[PDB]
Amino acid sequence: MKRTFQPSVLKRNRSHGFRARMATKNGRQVLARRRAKGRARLTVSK
Amino acid sequence: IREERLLKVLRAPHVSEKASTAMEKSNTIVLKVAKDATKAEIKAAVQKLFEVEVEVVNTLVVKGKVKRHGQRIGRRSDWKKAYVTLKEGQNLDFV
Amino acid sequence: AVVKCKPTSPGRRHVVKVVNPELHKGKPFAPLLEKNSKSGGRNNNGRITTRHIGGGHKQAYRIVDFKRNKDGIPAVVERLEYDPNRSANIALVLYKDGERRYILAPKGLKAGDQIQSGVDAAIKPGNTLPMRNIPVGSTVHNVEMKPGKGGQLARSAGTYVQIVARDGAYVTLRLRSGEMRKVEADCRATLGEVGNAEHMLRVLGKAGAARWRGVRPTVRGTAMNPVDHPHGGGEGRNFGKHPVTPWGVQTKGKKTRSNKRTDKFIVRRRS
RNA sequence: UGCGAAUGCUGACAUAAGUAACGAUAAAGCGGGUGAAAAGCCCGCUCGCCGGAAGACCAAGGGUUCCUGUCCAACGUUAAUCGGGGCAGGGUGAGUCGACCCCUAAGGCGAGGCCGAAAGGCGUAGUCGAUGGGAAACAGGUUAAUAUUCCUGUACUUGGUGUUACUGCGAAGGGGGGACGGAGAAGGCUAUGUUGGCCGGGCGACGGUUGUCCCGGUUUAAGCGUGUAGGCUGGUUUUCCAGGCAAAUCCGGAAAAUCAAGGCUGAGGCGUGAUGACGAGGCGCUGAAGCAACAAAUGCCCUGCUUCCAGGAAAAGCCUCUAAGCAUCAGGUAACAUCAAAUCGUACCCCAAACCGACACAGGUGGUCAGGUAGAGAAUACCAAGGCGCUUGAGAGAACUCGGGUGAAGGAACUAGGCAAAAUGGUGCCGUAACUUCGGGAGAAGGCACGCUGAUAUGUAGGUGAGGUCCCUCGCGGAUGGAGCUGAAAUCAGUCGAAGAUACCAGCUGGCUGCAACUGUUUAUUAAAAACACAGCACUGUGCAAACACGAAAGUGGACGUAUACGGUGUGACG
RNA sequence: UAUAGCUUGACACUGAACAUUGAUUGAUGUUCUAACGUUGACCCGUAAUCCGGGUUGCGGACAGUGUCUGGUGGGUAGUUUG
Ligand SMILES: [Mg+2]
Ligand SMILES: [Mg+2]
Ligand SMILES: [Mg+2]
Ligand SMILES: [Mg+2]
Ligand SMILES: [Mg+2]
Ligand SMILES: [Mg+2]
Ligand SMILES: [Mg+2]
Ligand SMILES: [Mg+2]
Ligand SMILES: [Mg+2]
Ligand SMILES: [Mg+2]
Ligand SMILES: [Mg+2]
Ligand SMILES: [Mg+2]
Ligand SMILES: [Mg+2]
Ligand SMILES: [Mg+2]
Ligand SMILES: [Mg+2]
Ligand SMILES: [Mg+2]
Ligand SMILES: [Mg+2]
Ligand SMILES: [Mg+2]
Ligand SMILES: [Mg+2]
Ligand SMILES: [Mg+2]
Ligand SMILES: [Mg+2]
Ligand SMILES: [Mg+2]
Ligand SMILES: [Mg+2]
Ligand SMILES: [Mg+2]
Ligand SMILES: [Mg+2]
Ligand SMILES: [Mg+2]
Ligand SMILES: [Mg+2]
Ligand SMILES: [Mg+2]
Ligand SMILES: [Mg+2]
Ligand SMILES: [Mg+2]
Ligand SMILES: [Mg+2]
Ligand SMILES: [Mg+2]
Ligand SMILES: [Mg+2]
Ligand SMILES: [Mg+2]
Ligand SMILES: [Mg+2]
Ligand SMILES: [Mg+2]
Ligand SMILES: [Mg+2]
Ligand SMILES: [Mg+2]
Ligand SMILES: [Mg+2]
Ligand SMILES: [Mg+2]
Ligand SMILES: [Mg+2]
Ligand SMILES: [Mg+2]
Ligand SMILES: [Mg+2]
Ligand SMILES: [Mg+2]
Ligand SMILES: [Mg+2]
Ligand SMILES: [Mg+2]
Ligand SMILES: [Mg+2]
Ligand SMILES: [Mg+2]
Ligand SMILES: [Mg+2]
Ligand SMILES: [Mg+2]
Ligand SMILES: [Mg+2]
Ligand SMILES: [Mg+2]
Ligand SMILES: [Mg+2]
Ligand SMILES: [Mg+2]
Ligand SMILES: [Mg+2]
Ligand SMILES: [Mg+2]
Ligand SMILES: [Mg+2]
Ligand SMILES: [Mg+2]
Ligand SMILES: [Mg+2]
Ligand SMILES: [Mg+2]
Ligand SMILES: [Mg+2]
Ligand SMILES: [Mg+2]
Ligand SMILES: [Mg+2]
Ligand SMILES: [Mg+2]
Ligand SMILES: [Mg+2]
Ligand SMILES: [Mg+2]
Ligand SMILES: [Mg+2]
Ligand SMILES: [Mg+2]
Ligand SMILES: [Mg+2]
Ligand SMILES: [Mg+2]
Ligand SMILES: [Mg+2]
Ligand SMILES: [Mg+2]
Ligand SMILES: [Mg+2]
Ligand SMILES: [Mg+2]
Ligand SMILES: [Mg+2]
Ligand SMILES: [Mg+2]
Ligand SMILES: [Mg+2]
Ligand SMILES: [Mg+2]
Ligand SMILES: [Mg+2]
Ligand SMILES: [Mg+2]
Ligand SMILES: [Mg+2]
Ligand SMILES: [Mg+2]
Ligand SMILES: [Mg+2]
Ligand SMILES: [Mg+2]
Ligand SMILES: [Mg+2]
Ligand SMILES: [Mg+2]
Ligand SMILES: [Mg+2]
Ligand SMILES: [Mg+2]
Ligand SMILES: [Mg+2]
Ligand SMILES: [Mg+2]
Ligand SMILES: [Mg+2]
Ligand SMILES: [Mg+2]
Ligand SMILES: [Mg+2]
Ligand SMILES: [Mg+2]
Ligand SMILES: [Mg+2]
Ligand SMILES: [Mg+2]
Ligand SMILES: [Mg+2]
Ligand SMILES: [Mg+2]
């Protein structure tokens, strides 16, 4: 049957993209936390 | 267009079976060009350097494949492929 | 006219509709409609501020003239039209200078009638003028509350207010709810009553009829759980508590009006 | 600092055990080839399955899985020479397809602004935001892999510039259009199919088959011209008023003069496109026929028409009118000639082994195409095009389990309970009770006929409809006319079988009674119900800056509503 | 046991003049504008249903807000119930 993950790139980028993170302050804090940990991938941008 | 710009747009002639078949049947040469080279500057650089009269230019961006050199996995860079169509009375000059 | 459907199917048994043959058929006037998007009972925050709203048919908004500021210009009723936004029907009127507008169709006004609005206008159904010039005891509708704000009182179908007294600058009106309210005499009104008085004799007949108008199902608080409604749940059918709204406030008789700004304008409460 | 325990943590290895299982019972057999090795690879002939799909093609999602060569280390639930596996190379060609771009919906952000301990919330002007509106291409050919992109032929759209001949052009403004609902139906059509003609080939391993016989084909687009079935709508003129903030020659209103027409839209048809392409076959060359009638779409006219209430986007492109400003200038118009149409995607899978399910998983996944025979039918059965035999096989034919078939006599005696099974099942006609809200109950119940052949009637009723004749500007015209094609149903007589709704498909029925009026909703994953909802009823609050609700507040919903309205509560048709 | 909300009074924003009236000081009522409200009208910023300013009109020391305060307050919260 229908599972919980329905892949859509538009919804993905509008929810978790880089510009979405930079738009809000908590998103910028998330990006800072990810840069501090040394994540090779900050967001879902491709 | 800048003369220094046309010198850098061309990369290399593309050797292949399809390219050779098009060269002797459609009178079209396949060339490796810069990724940012447009059709206008491609035609200008070809007419300036190869000394051939270009009819029309078709381009396409080839995506790089994933390979493995030893134990490391890499991704080859992308490159644009130009189908330069010369006029019927024009042959190609190799220099 | 009023007509009862035939009990062919179980949904048409109790349906009682009102079909007006004098209403215009076809698309309304083009340069008088506006985009009207449904809300669903949700405010700017997105939460449901008013329950039981949502769905229904699509509706274009008809710009209705409630102020009637075009004074000293005769107008002729072109045709009565249907309005889904209000319970009263509207009438497209044409002015002497070639201007079309929407007005609340009063009771009895048919196509081809002459209407005017102004201090110099005449006393007839559909004419607008300041309440200081309207004779006492007359039945008016689309009455303003401020001098130049537009008609707010008696705008539904079959509603009307009566001028019970005029003393100085204020005019005492008897509202449709039985209230006596003082209003500035400089405010305007329209003679007659609001048409479509047979609107209250209609019966939907089925839940689908209510769902077409944007009304959603109402769940009784007694059928909910204690966490959902103050009436809460229980073992079987138990109430055991005073009836209250779903926020703790006691309904069924408790007055909720608290407004000291407009008490001076209210003569006698309803009953 | 000492380990045997803490259902202790990590790694390795036993046990069950060479046991279950190898993932839909659609199915395989044989010959040849390669190969170390062949049930699984390729080729060939038979067999079986799907065929509103297990076929074809897109949008999402994935990203090289696409094609070629090579390898069988690991992966593939077996082997593997094979692969969506490893390695190398190749492959995606656009002014016309989509993105991009112009315009907006819901919604988002938001200069100033308001509000708020801060962080921030709302929001004007604006700017983003498709799932919507806006310019333009078709047919054939070609690769191992791309094609509406490459080639051939034949087209179309937009913009810049230059020249020639005319000319009031101009918006961040006004008007029109864009521009819009459900259901029903038939008038003409087309896609398409059947048959007849013609063309090419055959005269059949077994009784006949030179004919009313067998097989196959019988195709052709966009565009341009013509302007038809149909649909909508009176046209031109002049004087006036100024509603569209200013103006208007535009729209709006008024008055008279005039003509019986005018304009817009519009499938399909025909000519051209096309002396071409394609074309069964024959020898990379050539290549005949390529027509007619009938039937007919859910597709087109049709954004039509009728009807109904629940009353059914916006803006831009486009047309039109002028303000400021410019008057041999600019700008606009018509013709021609050149230039430009950039960038990005294009491979491949999308009823799946490639997306979502940890899997090469009996699940899910939006959109378009829609052949023949029966059939009302997109059901169903068998087939076409096309695609597959589902990645462990070979034997035997125990109990037992699973899915089915049949069954003497009896027929619910079983069981908590007719659970499950068995049974009915279609068309046409006849006929049909209590009760009833007069609509129903009802397909009540029940009964009769159904195949094939001949005649009525060498094919009737009906449908379509050619040639000829007459009429009129003279035509895609009207009357006539009926060839031809097509074509039910009924009766009569005969006939065959056990049986003619012969297969698949395809109501079991009646009586009493509780509950809920009913159609609907509900505990995704043990409860679908008497529970929830519901139309109806009553009470109650609210006079608008409404009550009420979300918000420290601003603000928003209520509602661009106004007591015949809105909110809350209880009950639940109707008598 | 508290608290959001609702609600009562006092003080501040919050004034003027008169009449009645309880004790130089309070309360009541009637008029007024100048505080303040205006989700009434027009104009400007401005080719803007936000906002600000101006004029006018209507309300008007009312409403409303701040501190303190009495009541109510399973709406919410923390707990007890040997
Ligand atoms: Mg080209
Ligand atoms: Mg390209
Ligand atoms: Mg790189
Ligand atoms: Mg509009
Ligand atoms: Mg609204
Ligand atoms: Mg309600
Ligand atoms: Mg409405
Ligand atoms: Mg209810
Ligand atoms: Mg109700
Ligand atoms: Mg419950
Ligand atoms: Mg419970
Ligand atoms: Mg409670
Ligand atoms: Mg009980
Ligand atoms: Mg009791
Ligand atoms: Mg140890
Ligand atoms: Mg121990
Ligand atoms: Mg254990
Ligand atoms: Mg064992
Ligand atoms: Mg065993
Ligand atoms: Mg076994
Ligand atoms: Mg098996
Ligand atoms: Mg199994
Ligand atoms: Mg060999
Ligand atoms: Mg073999
Ligand atoms: Mg096999
Ligand atoms: Mg084979
Ligand atoms: Mg089927
Ligand atoms: Mg395919
Ligand atoms: Mg993609
Ligand atoms: Mg993947
Ligand atoms: Mg790709
Ligand atoms: Mg790979
Ligand atoms: Mg492959
Ligand atoms: Mg081996
Ligand atoms: Mg293996
Ligand atoms: Mg390979
Ligand atoms: Mg491979
Ligand atoms: Mg396009
Ligand atoms: Mg918006
Ligand atoms: Mg914002
Ligand atoms: Mg700011
Ligand atoms: Mg935009
Ligand atoms: Mg779109
Ligand atoms: Mg392909
Ligand atoms: Mg406009
Ligand atoms: Mg329009
Ligand atoms: Mg639309
Ligand atoms: Mg429709
Ligand atoms: Mg046809
Ligand atoms: Mg022959
Ligand atoms: Mg023989
Ligand atoms: Mg034949
Ligand atoms: Mg006119
Ligand atoms: Mg209609
Ligand atoms: Mg109605
Ligand atoms: Mg001028
Ligand atoms: Mg492609
Ligand atoms: Mg493709
Ligand atoms: Mg699909
Ligand atoms: Mg599947
Ligand atoms: Mg998968
Ligand atoms: Mg498999
Ligand atoms: Mg699968
Ligand atoms: Mg079929
Ligand atoms: Mg058939
Ligand atoms: Mg059948
Ligand atoms: Mg089959
Ligand atoms: Mg086949
Ligand atoms: Mg397939
Ligand atoms: Mg298998
Ligand atoms: Mg057996
Ligand atoms: Mg069995
Ligand atoms: Mg059986
Ligand atoms: Mg038996
Ligand atoms: Mg028997
Ligand atoms: Mg029996
Ligand atoms: Mg029995
Ligand atoms: Mg028994
Ligand atoms: Mg027994
Ligand atoms: Mg059963
Ligand atoms: Mg059965
Ligand atoms: Mg029957
Ligand atoms: Mg019955
Ligand atoms: Mg026909
Ligand atoms: Mg017999
Ligand atoms: Mg059934
Ligand atoms: Mg009982
Ligand atoms: Mg029920
Ligand atoms: Mg039901
Ligand atoms: Mg359940
Ligand atoms: Mg329920
Ligand atoms: Mg507020
Ligand atoms: Mg509001
Ligand atoms: Mg109840
Ligand atoms: Mg009851
Ligand atoms: Mg304002
Ligand atoms: Mg408590
Ligand atoms: Mg504690």
Numbering used by the authors:
A (entry chain d): 1 to 46
B (entry chain U): 2 to 96
C (entry chain C): 2 to 272
What do the authors say?
In all living cells, ribosomes are responsible for translating the genetic information from mRNAs to proteins.
In this study, we determined the cryo-electron microscopy (cryo-EM) structure of an E. coli 70S ribosome in complex with mRNA, a P-site tRNA and CDZ, resolved at 3.0 Å. The subset containing two tRNAs in P and E-sites of the ribosome revealed the presence of the quinoxolidinone antibiotic and was refined to higher resolution by focusing refinement on the 50S subunit, resulting in reconstructions reaching overall resolutions of 3.0 Å. In the focused reconstruction we could unambiguously identify the density of the CCA-acyl end of a charged P-site tRNA and CDZ bound in the vicinity of the PTC. Overall, the oxazolidinone moiety of CDZ binds to the same pocket and in a similar orientation as other oxazolidinone antibiotics, with the A- and B-rings forming the main interface next to the polypeptide exit tunnel at the PTC. The 2-oxazolidone A-ring is bound to the PTC pocket in a similar fashion as oxazolidinones, in the close vicinity of G2061, stacking against U2504 with its hydroxymethyl tail oriented towards A2503. The fluoroquinolone moiety is oriented towards the empty A-site tRNA binding pocket of the PTC, where it could be reasonably modelled in two alternative conformations: one with the cyclopropyl group pointing towards the P-site tRNA and one pointing towards residue A2507 of the rRNA. However, in the other conformation, A2602 is “flipped-out”, thereby stacking on top of the fluoroquinolone moiety.
